[PDB]
Amino acid sequence: SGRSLLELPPELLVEIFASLPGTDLPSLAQVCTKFRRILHTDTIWRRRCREEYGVCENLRKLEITGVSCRDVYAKLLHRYRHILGLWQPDIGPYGGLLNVVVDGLFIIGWMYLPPHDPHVDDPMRFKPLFRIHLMERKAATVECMYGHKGPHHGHIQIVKKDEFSTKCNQTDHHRMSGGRQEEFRTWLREEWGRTLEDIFHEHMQELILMKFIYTSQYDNCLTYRRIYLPPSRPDDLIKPGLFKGTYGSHGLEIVMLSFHGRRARGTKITGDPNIPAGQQTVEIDLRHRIQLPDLENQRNFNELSRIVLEVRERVRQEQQEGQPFVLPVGVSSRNEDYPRTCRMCFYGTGLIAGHGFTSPERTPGVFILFDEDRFGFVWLELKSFSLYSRVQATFRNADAPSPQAFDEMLKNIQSLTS
């Protein structure tokens, strides 16, 4: 009988408003005097920031900086919501990994790079590429973080749900007193932990230079496309996500493992001029296990080849109508510290192509599972072994909406480099 919303005591109104999506609060504020006044109350906004974007703001920080959670929600978090998440830059065939993330009164674009070849078990390296900073009484600023000469002015541009780009406006900061050579020597130290000497020999010297020159022509003016981490699944899985992998002379590349029924897929997150970022590097057939012999038979390469080509044949028929481990003799492995015990093996195929991604093709191989987060692929026709190891880092905002959204994402990044 009679009572209205407007008669509830403030504390109660605050509790109700505090439970709503922050996007409903602005309508509420325009309803009347009283609601506008009540919606100043920062607790409401501090909660909206916590639940919707995972950020707890420090109260002491807020007091010092003179910024409020209302400000944060309106001018940082909502304003830039579409660039948050996990991204792959469009850099010819090389790709990349950017996780764009909230930290306090900042939004940070973190670039994740692999460790030095061949140390696939070492942690990912990570420098910041750009940040977005909110200060009192102004719009958040956008700064490019690339270079060695500190934060400076940048621009962000949101094109779509699933694409954005960055411009740097004072590239003078990416330069160095000892010139492009030092830029190169520096980049070489971070990416390789080696000098011009250890690389001048030789086919990798060339590939490494081309990469430096090619990627650095972007001066951090870069377009990013959305990627997602893969769906987890219980019985029907043995554990998806990003891995660091050896790709011969190209060094390590980042490769995403994902499950799709009785097949696992390895999708390139970074790549090279032979098989670019976005492509299917590897496809594991999970209904064709391969029994592991004793060490002495594992050593025999031709036994392994005969066995693998057998399975390839039986597969072509179908479609048409842990113990000690050792690589066979004559199979190269950049790593050498590959585990000497494994839990199981499966038939699979890998994608190969000549320079320029020319005439790609599937070659047979065998996938080797060591432990929950280390696996391998023997490239049969190249007598070569790739050793993969899980990226331990944790990623914020990177989950897919659904399994079909993921599958869709895979098809977009593949087509981009097709």
């Binding site: 086919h203 002379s249 190209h250 190249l382």
Partner: peptide, 9 residues
């Protein structure tokens, strides 16, 4: 090493 064609991966 089998650089003769390892690059194709």
């Amino acid at each position: 090493p089998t650089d003769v064609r390892d690059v194709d991966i």
